[PDB]
Amino acid sequence: HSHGLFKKLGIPGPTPLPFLGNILSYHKGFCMFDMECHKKYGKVWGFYDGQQPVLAITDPDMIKTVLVKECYSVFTNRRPFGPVGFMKSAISIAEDEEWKRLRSLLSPTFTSGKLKEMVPIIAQYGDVLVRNLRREAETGKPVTLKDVFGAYSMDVITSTSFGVNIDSLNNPQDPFVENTKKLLRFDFLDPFFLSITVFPFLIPILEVLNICVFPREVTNFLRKSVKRMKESRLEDTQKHRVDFLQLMIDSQNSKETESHKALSDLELVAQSIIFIFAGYETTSSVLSFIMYELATHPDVQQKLQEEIDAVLPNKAPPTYDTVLQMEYLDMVVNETLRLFPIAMRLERVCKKDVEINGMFIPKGVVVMIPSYALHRDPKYWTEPEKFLPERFSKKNKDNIDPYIYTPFGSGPRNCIGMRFALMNMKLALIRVLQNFSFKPCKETQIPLKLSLGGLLQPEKPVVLKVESRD
Ligand code: HEM
Ligand SMILES: CC(C)(C)C(=O)Nc1cc(C(F)(F)F)ccc1-n1ccnc1
């Protein structure tokens, strides 16, 4: 049907099969498929997710035109991916004027001033993470990275979102923990999402049956939990709060909002759920990738510890202002996010026929930016498969195009939790690297292989040795 669009436009790409399209080439994952297409078809190519045409662009000026210049007019929304129910109101999934209103109401929640008031909360569980790591390091047994960092990530979320203080690693069956730990990333290559891709006409059938990709038992638990909190926080009003929930509760009074608009009780819960979803498995994945590189590159881990002890002597606790002063820490995070951009791709839907930078894009075509393929392009990065934090030093960081290196996207629809996630991971790294040093063991995959699913995660869970400093 549509499997002749890119042929008439003179656009190269893999030859699509009927019904399926190009989904069969996903057997090596999204990342490998983008790398192969880039090497075989050049600067632009086209493929099909079932019937949906997708045009991949690599020109930085063209990427800027899609993500920045033509955002509000042409490339405003992301691709609909399945039955979302009321989670259609999540700012990541929202569309058109609905997204712009949510982006206006939610942007003051993520200012650097509001984050600084959240720093003492995040640093508290950095000390909790250390204590839980001291107990495991004294056993001498190797530590699974996803477990200790998923627990830290969960501790920060429950406290920064709703002011609920739990030690997730040691209280694993708290009803608040047991449900929030079910908010796992979406494997768009699993049997269900592949079937939704081949049968996109079945999505309206699943929506009327109230079938949601998010667990309905988990969403109901949070909708009732937020309701009880909003009622309870109306009594204990004199306690000044700083968590994400109260910033959204206060923003529900349009008379005190800079946008002169108000948040819905339905929308507020939707963002609270998507904030947990966006921060839980993502923060632990990046922190695990970082610690793998530091352990497999002891010179980088030592130099990072030397900078930390220089900025924070005598195991001084990390603060907001001191984390910004650590540049090699910023270079370790940035270089890891280059090798592992967990978003893999950036997508926008074309709302109307447009010709940008000398190329005609039809209406309804999903324009995709291959972040993983561009982060490892040997044209822009020398020895791209190597972990070299010096690429982001103050000397060479100016040679980095903001549209080739897009770990948090770009434009008005960039990651709204970029500064928070950067501050959260850095606070964890400082406390962890102050007290510990991470070494490989025989059960560590020294040549790290990545999973072939739809998630940018290690094939085998990263496991390392923890040894106490002094
Ligand atoms: C280190 C972890 C994270 C990474 C690598 C990351 C990366 C990204 C990327 C690549 C996008 C797509 C932007 C684009 O389309 O241009 C995005 C969107 C988004 N992220 Fe994150 N993100 C992270 C953590 C978080 C956290 C913790 C939150 C919680 C507040 C969050 C909230 C969002 C939201 C709300 C959007 C969509 C905003 C929009 O629709 O305008 N992210 N993120
Ligand atoms: C695995 C990864 C990183 C690709 C992902 O989980 N992305 C994502 C998807 C959705 C949605 F599909 F449900 F719509 C909402 C929010 C986020 N997100 C996470 C961090 N920053 C934004």
From Swiss-Prot:
BP GO terms, sorted: aflatoxin metabolic process; alkaloid catabolic process; androgen metabolic process; cholesterol metabolic process; estrogen metabolic process; lipid hydroxylation; lipid metabolic process; long-chain fatty acid biosynthetic process
Name of protein: Cytochrome P450 3A4
Description of what induces expression: By drugs, such as rifampicin.
Protein purpose: A cytochrome P450 monooxygenase involved in the metabolism of sterols, steroid hormones, retinoids and fatty acids. Mechanistically, uses molecular oxygen inserting one oxygen atom into a substrate, and reducing the second into a water molecule, with two electrons provided by NADPH via cytochrome P450 reductase (NADPH--hemoprotein reductase). Catalyzes the hydroxylation of carbon-hydrogen bonds.
Protein family (similarity comment): Belongs to the cytochrome P450 family.
Gene Ontology cellular-component annotations: cytoplasm; endoplasmic reticulum membrane; intracellular membrane-bounded organelle
Activity regulation: Activated by cytochrome b5.
Pfam families assigned to the protein according to its UniProt record, in alphabetical order: p450
Organism: Homo sapiens
